[PDB]
Amino acid sequence: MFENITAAPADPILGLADLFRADERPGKINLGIGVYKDETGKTPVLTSVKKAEQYLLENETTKNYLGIDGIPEFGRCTQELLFGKGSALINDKRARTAQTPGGTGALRVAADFLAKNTSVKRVWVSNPSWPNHKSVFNSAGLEVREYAYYDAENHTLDFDALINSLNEAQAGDVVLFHGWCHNPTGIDPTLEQWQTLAQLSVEKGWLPLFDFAYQGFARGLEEDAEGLRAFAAMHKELIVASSYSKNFGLYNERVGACTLVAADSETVDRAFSQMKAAIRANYSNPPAHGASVVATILSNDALRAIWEQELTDMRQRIQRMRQLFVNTLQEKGANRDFSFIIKQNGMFSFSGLTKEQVLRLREEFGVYAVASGRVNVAGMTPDNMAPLCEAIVAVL
Amino acid sequence: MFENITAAPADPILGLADLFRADERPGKINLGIGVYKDETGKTPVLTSVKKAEQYLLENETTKNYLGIDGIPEFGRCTQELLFGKGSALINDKRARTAQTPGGTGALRVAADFLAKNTSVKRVWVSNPSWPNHKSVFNSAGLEVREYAYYDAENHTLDFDALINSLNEAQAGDVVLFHGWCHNPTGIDPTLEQWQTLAQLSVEKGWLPLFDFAYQGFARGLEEDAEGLRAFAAMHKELIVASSYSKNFGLYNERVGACTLVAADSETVDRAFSQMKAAIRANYSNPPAHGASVVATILSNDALRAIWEQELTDMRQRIQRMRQLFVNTLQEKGANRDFSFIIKQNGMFSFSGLTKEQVLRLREEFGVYAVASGRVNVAGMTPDNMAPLCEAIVAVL
Ligand SMILES: *Cc1c(COP(=O)(O)O)cnc(C)c1O
Ligand SMILES: *Cc1c(COP(=O)(O)O)cnc(C)c1O
């Protein structure tokens, strides 16, 4: 039965992590996958997280199955983070959230749900976008169409191209928007731009789907949620696939959420019963550990104060590395002006390196970046900045 | 977009857990979902598990993403449990395993993989079988056909009906077999019967898919794996979706595995690259906590000795409850002879109660059983045995 199965191509992000592993070179540098590193080049378990974990170790009395949708408190805390504490969506009971295995799990559950319960056949994704978006949607059997976004020449969000590209989107299509800290460009719309978009979707009949994986990495928790909140106020319906992998440094515990919003309580509960059926036919119910760590921290004021500071430290450290990167490139003779990278948000900077330069960097210098030229600024430290900047100016 | 979504019907197993929750009756009894209970009617975290968890709390230094296929050691320990320590499959590198979110996750990954990479269009499941099998396979777009199994009249495995039913299965179809402790009947084939089946699949060209969720609940770890091992010796290809939810009491951490076996190392690695692609487009990578607990215990001799005894205690306690159940029914005037239940293996006994009796039990007496008449013997305790047996004889 398997004789003719052809090998799948390596994952552009995750397979990169393998090559780097197998690399016996001493000075190799990561920069590929979106995982935070501290000053020492390590990815430690957050202190608020370690504390919540002892708490769970001393307090859990059972590992009995959670319901299909997970821990209720987790769901509530998630909605408050997303929409705000006194949100009308929350007060009118217009939103239901299911705990899922990571943000990817949330996107797939959203896809399966839409493919099986609505008339959706098309999902619009930005050019460029997280490479795995296409795979997830194609998996549920939906086609992916792409909308213009990035202006490679000016390193700006080409807004008119974005709008004119979206005019080919029909009423009933799904349009995918990144929350804030666009992966891979780091270029995001202004609040004014988010409002224009919110009113155009409403007028055009698009169903917004937000992939929110970096809440807290641009300006703050509540600020980073402004685009989505702009949208939540206008729309009767929307879905949010959020992730706690990055903002809680909980990557491998698989903590995410799929939030479904409908015009009313009655409709959303009915639509949610089908979302639950899609989950049962997939992984049954979600993994408790990571999600209970998140609920514990968000529900406890002392633990929450510690986590918020840890997140602030991650954010600030990345901001410092960005400046450090553009300066060092300059003082190493990387003649090209890389100042636009200071203008990007989040863990990543879209460097503008070509497929071949990205390839040479690795084979000749052992510094690993995604083939699209996307580099993980959070993977940079004061110690690896110079060898890294030295490799870059040499392939330029 | 969601105005016309119709509510999904409640899950026959998981939705039962909700009704029981919402039940304000004092003497209500569970018996529905397949979760073990000790003498006190609680589902404690195993002692070996609590210990492995402190170990992880003191020793983990990162939550960085696992690879798509999970923790390597987890994969190795799994293959040894399944095939045996000195297995030829293991030595010839004919098997690859991916850590997945529970056994359900493993079945779905197997389904997606088969639907997208092979010519499979049909999956044969036993009548009766775990209610969720149909949903998982239909989700990947495969149809489910059913083979005869249970003889309701004699409470036996109707073996000729099983064989004659399977003669309608074509070369290239998938045939699903339960490892041991068949859910829901508890009726399993003899080793001789397993050999006859192994040779018939090989001759007929069926691809065996084993759902192994109760390893250790019938006679022992290695004995319960005899049917599958009978099959592994004859087949060039097979897939195993195993679960550690029940045997490790790790229900909510979602710990399972999907093991792919091909004729050789080269073929299995190629087929596995596609399995990994199906995982990436689903939940990306697996949850670390439960799986590392399992690897820690299986890799440590002291921790393993404790766990094996805990599992032995669960097994024995269930065996005692079974005897207790048939005796108490007898001394309460449940005139029907329920002795066949002593002959069933695992957590469940297929009681033979009708849809309406199962329904009356709940509404009039608050004892919850699955509508098929399946009852969780592991949910019985010396304290609830009498009220339970009293309710049963009253609806008889
Ligand atoms: C990291 C990321 C994901 C994946 O989240 P997981 O929680 O790791 O599944 C999805 N979308 C975007 C834009 C991401 O950056
Ligand atoms: C319990 C069970 C499952 C589900 O396993 P999870 O690990 O809970 O996903 C699948 N198949 C059978 C036969 C089961 O008994």
The pair of three-digit structure tokens given for residue A280, joined into one six-digit string = 């049962």
Query: B45-315: what fold?
Result: Aspartate Aminotransferase; domain 2 (3.40.640)
- Catalytic-residue membership of B246: yes
β-strand partners of B157: B150
Give the SS3 label for residue B8.
Answer: coil
**At a CB cut-off of 8 Å and minimum separation 6, what does A64 contact?**
B35, B43, B251, B252
Q: Residue B318 — left, alpha, or beta (φ > 0 → left; ψ -120 to 50 → alpha)?
A: alpha
Burial (CB < 10 A; 0-12, 13-18, 19+), residue B1, is buried
**A207 interaction partners in chain B (CB closer than 8 Å):** 1
Alpha carbon of B226: minimum distance to chain A alpha carbons (Å)? 24
Give the SS3 label for residue B68.
Answer: coil
Q: Counting atoms of ligand 2 from 1, which one is nearest the CA of A283?
A: 9
Give the SS3 label for residue B242.
Answer: strand
CA distance A348 to A251: 17
Long-range Cβ pairs for the range B53-57 (8 Å, 24+): B53/A57, B53/B293, B54/A57, B55/B296, B56/B289, B56/B292, B56/B293, B56/B296, B57/A50, B57/A53, B57/A54, B57/A57
Experimental technique behind these coordinates:
X-ray
DSSP B235: -
Is the Cβ–Cβ distance between A341 and A326 less than 8 Å?
yes
Cα separations in angstroms, B148 against A28, B210, B212: 59, 17, 20
Give the dihedral sign, CA B367/B317/B180/B76: positive
Cα(B378) to centroid(ligand 2), Å: 15
Helix/strand/coil (H/E/C) assignment for every residue in chain A: CCCCCCCCCCCCCCCHHHHHHCCCCCCCECCCCCCCCCCCCCCCCCHHHHHHHHHHHHHCCCCCCCCCCCCHHHHHHHHHHHHCCCCHHHHCCCEEEEEECHHHHHHHHHHHHHHHHCCCCEEEEEECCCCHHHHHHHHCCCEEEEEECEECCCCEECHHHHHHHHCCCCCCCEEEEECCCCCCCCCCCCHHHHHHHHHHHHHHCCEEEEEECCCCCCCCCCCCCHHHHHHHHHCCCEEEEEECCCCCCCHHHCCEEEEEECCCHHHHHHHHHHHHHHHHCCCCCCCHHHHHHHHHHHHCHHHHHHHHHHHHHHHHHHHHHHHHHHHHHHHCCCCCCCHHHHHCCCCEEECCCCHHHHHHHHHHHCECCCCCCEEEHHHCCCCCHHHHHHHHHHHC
Burial (CB < 10 A; 0-12, 13-18, 19+), residue A12, is middle
> Measuring CA to CA, which residue among A277, A306, A255 is closest to residue A75?
A255
Give, using CA atoms, the residue closest to atom 14 of ligand 1: A213
Contact check, Cβ <8 Å, A290/B287 = yes
* Exposure b/e, A29-68, CB count within 10 A at least 16 = b: bbbbbbbbbeeeeebbbbebbebbbebbeeebeebbbbbb
Is the Cβ–Cβ distance between A15 and A358 less than 8 Å?
no
Contact check, Cβ <8 Å, B273/A7 = yes
Contact check, Cβ <8 Å, B277/A252 = no
Is the Cβ–Cβ distance between A256 and A73 less than 8 Å?
no
Nominal resolution in Å?
1.9
* Exposure b/e, B85-98, CB count within 10 A at least 16 = b: eebebbeeebbbbb
Homologous superfamily, domain B11-44+316-396? Aspartate Aminotransferase, domain 1 (3.90.1150.10)
Domain extents in chain A: 11-44+316-396, 45-315
CA distance B392 to B386: 10
- Catalytic-residue membership of A134: no
In A, minimum Cα distance to B35 occurs at A64
